[PDB]
């Protein structure tokens, strides 16, 4: 509300989780030089730090039969 | 405080979708004379409207070898 | 004269495979109908939003 998300103005370090339970996909973003992580809308994270999202998914590859 | 769910207290018509993306399985429940459908925990719908759940499953069943 | 080199704008990725030893995307390009493969690392840099779109749909949560 007061101080949430990307507005805190820190540079994003890594995505530590993701959830769609609201109705839109969100990442749990851990930021550099902070240790409280918060949620961001995936649409924003996709445009603002595209390599962090690509890096997040790349670790999580699975192969189906 | 707005807590729409199974608690909305309207009578169920049919189950119109299902998802288990969160660790728990949930039905997208359609209610009578409303056009706002919401999610309910499956374990509740199993206990509260068992024939509505069974009706959802019977349509949609397929056979593998 | 193949691959990303053709200079077409990428439209969508339809599958991916690492069996060559590197991660590869099947890229469908805008305004052409011969689709070929691209290196994943290259696609990340050149069309990150296409890659995101491809990965995004395939997301699931396992036990």
């Amino acid at each position: 509300e007061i101080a949430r998300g990307f507005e805190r103005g820190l540079e994003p370090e890594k995505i530590i989780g993701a959830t769609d339970s609201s109705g839109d996909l969100m990442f749990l973003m851990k930021w550099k030089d902070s240790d409280e992580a918060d949620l961001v809308l995936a649409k924003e994270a996709n445009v603002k730090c595209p390599q962090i999202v690509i890096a997040f998914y790349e670790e999580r590859l699975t192969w189906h039969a | 405080e707005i807590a729409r769910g199974f608690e909305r207290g309207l009578e169920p018509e049919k189950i119109i979708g299902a998802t288990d993306s969160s660790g728990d399985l949930m039905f997208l429940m359609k209610w009578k004379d409303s056009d706002e459908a919401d999610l309910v925990l499956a374990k509740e719908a199993n206990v509260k409207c068992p024939q509505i759940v069974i009706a959802f499953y019977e349509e949609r069943l397929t056979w593998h070898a | 004269a193949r691959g990303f080199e053709r200079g077409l704008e990428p439209e969508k990725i339809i599958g991916a495979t690492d069996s060559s030893g590197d991660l590869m995307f099947l890229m469908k390009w805008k305004d052409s109908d011969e689709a070929d493969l691209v290196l994943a690392k290259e696609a990340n840099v050149k069309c990150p939003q296409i890659v995101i779109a491809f990965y995004e749909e395939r997301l699931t949560w396992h036990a």
Binding site: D20, L61, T62, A65 | - | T17, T60, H62
Partner: peptide, 16 residues
Amino acid sequence: RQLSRKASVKVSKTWS
């Protein structure tokens, strides 16, 4: 909080 689970991207080679 419960959606903090595995988080896999499902990818298949069934094409080609």
